[PDB]
Amino acid sequence: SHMLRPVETPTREIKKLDGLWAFSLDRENCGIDQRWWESALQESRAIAVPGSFNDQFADADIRNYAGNVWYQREVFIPKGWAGQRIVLRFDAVTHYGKVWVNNQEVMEHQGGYTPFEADVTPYVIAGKSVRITVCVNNELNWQTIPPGMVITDEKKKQSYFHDFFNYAGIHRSVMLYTTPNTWVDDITVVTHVAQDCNHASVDWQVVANGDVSVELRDADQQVVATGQGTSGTLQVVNPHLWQPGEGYLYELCVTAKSQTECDIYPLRVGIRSVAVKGEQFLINHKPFYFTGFGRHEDADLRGKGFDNVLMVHDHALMDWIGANSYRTSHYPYAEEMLDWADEHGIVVIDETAAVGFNLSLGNKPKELYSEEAVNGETQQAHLQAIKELIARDKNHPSVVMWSIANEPDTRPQGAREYFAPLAEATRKLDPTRPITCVNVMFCDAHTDTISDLFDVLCLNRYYGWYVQSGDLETAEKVLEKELLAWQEKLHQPIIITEYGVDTLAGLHSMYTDMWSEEYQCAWLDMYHRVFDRVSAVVGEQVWNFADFATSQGILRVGGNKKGIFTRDRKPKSAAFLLQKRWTGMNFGEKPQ
Amino acid sequence: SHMLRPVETPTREIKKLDGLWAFSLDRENCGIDQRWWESALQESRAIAVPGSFNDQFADADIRNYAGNVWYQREVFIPKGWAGQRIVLRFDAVTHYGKVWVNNQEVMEHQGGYTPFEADVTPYVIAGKSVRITVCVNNELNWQTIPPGMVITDENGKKKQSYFHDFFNYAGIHRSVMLYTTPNTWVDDITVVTHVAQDCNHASVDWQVVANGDVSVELRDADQQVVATGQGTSGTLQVVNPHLWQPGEGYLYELCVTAKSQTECDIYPLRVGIRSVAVKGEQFLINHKPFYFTGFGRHEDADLRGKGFDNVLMVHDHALMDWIGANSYRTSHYPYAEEMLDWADEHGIVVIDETAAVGFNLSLGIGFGNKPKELYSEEAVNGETQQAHLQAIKELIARDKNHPSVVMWSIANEPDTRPQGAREYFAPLAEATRKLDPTRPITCVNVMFCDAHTDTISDLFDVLCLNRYYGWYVQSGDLETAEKVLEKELLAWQEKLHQPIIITEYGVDTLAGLHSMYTDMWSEEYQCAWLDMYHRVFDRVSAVVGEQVWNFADFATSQGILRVGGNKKGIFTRDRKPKSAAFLLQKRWTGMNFGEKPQQ
């Protein structure tokens, strides 16, 4: 469970395994039987790690593959790591990985978007080359997060219920890292902030197999507070709060000392509180207004693979357009993104991979919550996905809210019985952040059965698109009516976590009609006018930052075209509309 | 200067410094005066290394910047490296870099496209963090490869003028790393692979520089020792050798051990056993005629500019393999060495080119006022020629052992009309042959320096012609273009009786522009015009190759000739195929591998 982000210290080294690996499909599904991990993969080819495997090859038969694929490389253990605790770590393997070091099985993970690792000290020798084999499986069933159904025809075909392509592979960094045989295994900080903002407290809890001391250092490396033992509270006079748009960070240096060994782990800490009060979202006791995007991890060639240039360029576009926030739609993002948000003061709604709990979007069993679909084991798997997300992200000050799912069908019998325990367990795992369950349009104010269990109303709305098609005048009436009915029903802060229309870049129309750039601008504008008239709306996240790949079908013109930007990051007209609205408002303040 | 590719060995470790660095412009040019390397960069932002700096930020003022920029990060020296020789290496900094480790100046390099490195043993402590600062300059002048002119406006604002048809991207384009050797190490290796006529025997010469006794083991792809030797130099005999063949690329491994009394070093060099030679109008690989198919390329992609990237390299190789391409040219600069490791392993044939494009003031591509004499003290001069010689030396020192590299191109499209041209190029031709006698040389020929006009192609072994009849002239007229093209190729065959590679033929093609009139800029014209070239090539016995310009659409300087860039791609910049990709697929997969097509 304990999952600290590897960082280089006087007591910790890292060796990235990113680069070219050997790669092989297993159409006969005989690689486990033939123990492929005991040899060089036969009939293999070069693949980039990190990256989705699907689009690296310009090959439809690989892109559409369902089953196991195999990655392998050789790596030299640094000579100096003799006597040291050596960990092998995968930041993310989509959706399942099993790992062998030479002929030793070392670890296994279900969940495509959070890290897994094993201590491999006993199975490697410092100064020698070792063989790493990974069996990666991209199949979804009713107990995976997200769910799906594999149909077999004779040949496997993956069915799934979410509007983004089922990219798979080693999407994020692989690495070896070291600790001493005494080490800091875990840290929780809780950051309290007086109402007047003129004092703050920092609770710590540490797990380590040796005596623990902590030093809190400011941005200038001046020690502002010190403590001892596994737990306690640091007092901070006149603290530099972590504020949206700035993101001042302290460093909590955790030392675990044995008589013989010592370990130093620096954790970035942003001093901020988050709370809902009535229909206001407060950060450091001040109302905040969310602007920005639903995103995806999606790009040409690399699929959902992490990439620094893309992270730099996309943050430069969000900065320029005046976005203050985003949501990790619809899975945990690369941790680098949360390190970025921490440092630049970007506000994040951190979401699990639990999209698709919904059989009514655009074969399938009769009852959504039943033994044959979302069941007891599904709910366990969902709890595990929430635990892994919070265990990874609990200390990121940029994360202001947990979204435990996107667009579940809450009409059917058993929805509330499924969600209640998940809402409760989320609050116990992290009491410091509000929780949400992002709401599908047809589960309206008069229909939805679970919104009372959550703190903030995150509504996905597309009136004037899938319904009242091309009619802004009717869409505006229906939208305003529904937001006010939500305000009346629950008196929670409302974030519109999804509003957008498919827009084909370069399609221009004097009739302002669907798919045109001019429609995208008129439709976003109508939404904005309505949001500004409703006092409960504390945010707006446009769907989507950029055009992204989907499953093939008649609704998707080479993918999802709701982007503000093209997949190659070129702006549509609507990017300039958002630039003016979001840079023209006062930072973090509801427009008028 | 000795430049072995770093590889992990029982005696050698590597630590990549790729990732996010601190970045700053220096618009006032006060960073050397204020010694910016002595502290945190002051007004900095995160940048990805490797990558061009220009397009990471969606910011015109950064994209169009001329002068110095500043890169910086901190890094821990691995504790276990104590007692090891520690080297800091940049695979490429475009166009100039100076490097500091804390406050010690350690390195400087001019030349945007090959590696530089320094022994930093004395300036670091194993187990402690050091600060690496890089001052990177992107300015071209008449002594840079490639050349250019910085125009300073009346307000002191710098604008880069340059004479080549690709955008002057700059930054740390390739991997940065620390690596170790023991204090005894293999510093340099040259192999020469000789191949009997009958192909049933081969010999492998070796030469090694190292501060210790040298032994070699040649191992086949199964890791079985086929030959052993001793000393800094000698010859290994190989019975029934598995030749490095185009389309397969079988590799041996030459393990070089340097042993002192106390420590030792093991360096494995991949060796492809193959001979290259020109005989008459044939280009011979392993004594058999070869026919080149494939592309002029560029290092160019969305967002990252000329930055290296594994996913792009995997995807592009899968597109070249699919379309039936057997070869490419590193137009117009040395490419990331990972490309030549790929070519070695899969048997792709490569024309390795220097960065010496732009030696030509009479094209319409690039971009103040051009000097009147191209070869003069005030333009291409003695110091330019020295800088060009240095660029050729550095390329060969890097690539001399890649079996995939079958020919050196020392420049692209110089103006060879003036008398100065032969005076400048002759000594460069001679010095290239001395540096590597195992490969033929070329100088890629511009269209207006025709068979009746050109003054230097006799000094080279292979005629690499860049031709665009029916585009820049005889615009849209396939009938006239075809006559002029055939006439000129036959005039070249008569004049020099060399093998001819068409190293550039292409037309601007806007993806999705379709025409029933088969006229310029349409997908249909791209198809009809490449087809007309193919028909002419197949009627000329001297034509041993065809490399389409270009693999993919790529960025250029803004101007009236370039519709958001160069649109001569077979693929779009996002790697989507134009109709002409399917035309090339049929011709190149329908011919016999490596064999001149027929009518």
Curated annotation (Swiss-Prot), chain B:
InterPro entries: Beta-gal/glucu_dom_sf, Galactose-bd-like_sf, Glyco_hydro_2, Glyco_hydro_2_AS, Glyco_hydro_2_cat, Glyco_hydro_2_CS, Glyco_hydro_2_Ig-like, Glyco_hydro_2_N. The keyword NAD does not apply. The active site is at residues 413, 504. It comes from the Bacteria. GO terms for molecular function: beta-glucuronidase activity; carbohydrate binding; identical protein binding. It catalyses: a beta-D-glucuronoside + H2O = D-glucuronate + an alcohol; 4-methylumbelliferone beta-D-glucuronate + H2O = 4-methylumbelliferone + D-glucuronate. Keywords: Glycosidase, Hydrolase. Potently inhibited by a set of synthetic compounds like thio-urea derivatives and analogs, and uronic isofagomine (UIFG) derivatives. Inhibitors of gut microbial beta-glucuronidases block the reactivation of glucuronidated cancer drugs, and thereby alleviate drug-induced GI toxicity. Resistant to thermal inactivation at 50 degrees Celsius. One of its GO terms (cellular component) is cytosol. SUPFAM superfamilies: (Trans)glycosidases, beta-Galactosidase/glucuronidase domain, Galactose-binding domain-like. A motif (N-K motif) lies at residues 566-568. The keyword Hydrolase applies. One of its GO terms (biological process) is glucuronoside catabolic process. D-glucuronate binds at residues 165, 412, 466, 472, 504, 549, 568. Optimum pH is 5.0-7.5. It holds the Pfam family Glyco_hydro_2_N. Homotetramer. NCBIfam families: PRK10150.1. The N-K motif seems to be a discriminant that could be employed as a fingerprint to identify beta-glucuronidases from the large GH2 family of proteins. Displays beta-glucuronidase activity with the artificial substrate p-nitrophenyl-beta-D-glucuronide (PNPG) and with 4-methylumbelliferyl-glucuronide. Is likely capable of scavenging glucuronate from a range of chemically distinct xenobiotic and endobiotic glucuronides present in the gastrointestinal (GI) tract, to be able to utilize these diverse sources of carbon. As part of the GI microbiome, this enzyme is able to reactivate glucuronide drug conjugates, such reactivated compounds can significantly damage the GI tract. Belongs to the glycosyl hydrolase 2 family. This is Beta-glucuronidase. The gene is uidA.
